[PDB]
């Protein structure tokens, strides 16, 4: 198995695999993809598969300023611009529907309300807001308020809706984000989640939102075009689990059932070291994996975090993963895959140009002399 053949995910048919990871660009000013967005996604749709930046499913599940949402009839037709060019160019795309949870601002909240958390337990993160006069800025993440059983219900709703909406809009499936310390996560990991009630205490219990999210948006949209991404150690977010072994294993084992498009996993610390632990013993991702395919999961295994050329070629004819997610170097890069087929070499990224702002360092870093 080459990095460079095609490859399927549960309906979805791809050119090759590699993958654009999803990237939080800020650059959706009122939640709505603008032009701009849809020239960017275009550059780069000789991915084999492009999951799009984070894409809540509610203002509520923002965290982040000027990010496009699913919420809006007007994000919709944006969004519907982007899929429809990414298509022209033969790509394939698939929305990451998102819920923050704990890692927002009052200011971005309906009402100025605290954002929404399984507990109430502020983290130590900061989010991108932008001032009235305009210049973007960090600040720290508000303190949260515990959900209820009603407000999870609401919250399943929004992602129904959601998933209809990314239909609606021409993707072509939908990546539910369950990584980096956000809304499903917290639910999922100890230091997070402290309830009391069925979603707290027990694997069983802290796993059954996650669960729920992912049952409610196949239900919608099809298993086969539903795909999710999990991140198992990551400090993202000021998370922490001491055992992710038996809670992550679980997890993969239930979407084992599922008949899911593809799993999307985050290898380490998100961005970070991929040897990341957080506990006694170092998390066995062969074992993870051996969890989903043994439960019976079909789904396509896309990894990511720290991959270059070379280790992603290896890591897909060993058969340890069966496509690789590339963010920063697609930032970089919108002909990738084309520098990565004929090693070519690779533009550097510029961090300072990652959040907000305009064109510069989001639509003009240069393809290749051709
Ligand atoms: C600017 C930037 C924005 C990101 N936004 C998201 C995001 O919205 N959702 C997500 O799941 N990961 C996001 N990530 C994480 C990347 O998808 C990926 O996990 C990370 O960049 C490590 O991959 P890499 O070594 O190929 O760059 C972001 C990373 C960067 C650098
Ligand atoms: O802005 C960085 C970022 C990283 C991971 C995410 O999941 C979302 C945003």
Redesign the pocket.
């Known amino acids: 198995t080459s990095l460079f053949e095609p490859a399927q995910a549960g309906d979805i048919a791809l050119a090759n695999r590699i993958v654009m ?5 800020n650059r959706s000013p009122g939640a709505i993809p603008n032009n701009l967005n849809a020239t960017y996604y275009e550059q780069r749709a000789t991915a084999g598969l492009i999951v799009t ?2 894409t809540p499913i509610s203002q509520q599940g923002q965290g982040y300023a000027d990010v496009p949402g699913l919420y809006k009839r007007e994000a919709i037709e944006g969004w519907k611009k982007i899929t429809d060019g990414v298509h022209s160019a033969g790509g394939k795309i698939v929305a ?1 529907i998102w819920h923050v949870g704990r890692i927002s601002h009052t200011s971005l909240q309906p009402h100025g309300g605290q954002p929404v958390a399984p507990s109430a337990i502020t983290a130590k993160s900061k989010t991108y807001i932008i001032n009235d006069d305009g210049t973007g800025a960090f600040a720290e993440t508000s303190e949260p308020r515990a959900l209820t059983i009603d407000d999870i219900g609401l919250i399943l709703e929004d992602y129904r809706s959601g998933a209809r909406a990314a239909l609606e809009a021409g993707f072509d499936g939908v990546e539910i ?1 369950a ?2 310390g956000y809304l499903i996560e917290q639910f999922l990991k100890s230091s997070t989640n402290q309830r009391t009630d069925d979603y707290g205490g027990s694997i069983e219990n802290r796993a059954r939102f996650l669960l729920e999210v992912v049952d409610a948006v196949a239900e919608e949209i099809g298993a086969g075009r539903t795909g999710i ?1 999990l991140s198992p150690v990551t400090p993202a977010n000021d998370i922490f689990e001491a055992d992710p072994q038996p809670l992550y294993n679980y997890v993969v084992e239930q979407l084992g059932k599922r008949n899911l498009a593809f799993i999307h996993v ?1 290898e380490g610390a ?2 970070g070291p991929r040897d990341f632990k957080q506990g006694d013993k170092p998390f066995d991702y062969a074992s993870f994996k051996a969890a989903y395919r043994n439960a019976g999961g079909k789904g396509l295994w896309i990894a ?4 270059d050329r070379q280790s992603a070629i290896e890591a897909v004819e060993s058969g340890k993963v069966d496509a690789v ?5 697609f ?1 970089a890069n919108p002909d990738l895959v084309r520098r990565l087929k004929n090693d070519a070499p690779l533009n550097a990224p510029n961090q300072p140009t ?2 907000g702002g305009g064109a510069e360092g989001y639509t003009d870093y240069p393809a290749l002399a051709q």
């Open positions: 990871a999803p990237l939080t660009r930046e984070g990451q984000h990584a980096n991404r985050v998100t961005g990511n975090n720290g991959y997610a590339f963010g920063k170097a930032i990652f959040y």
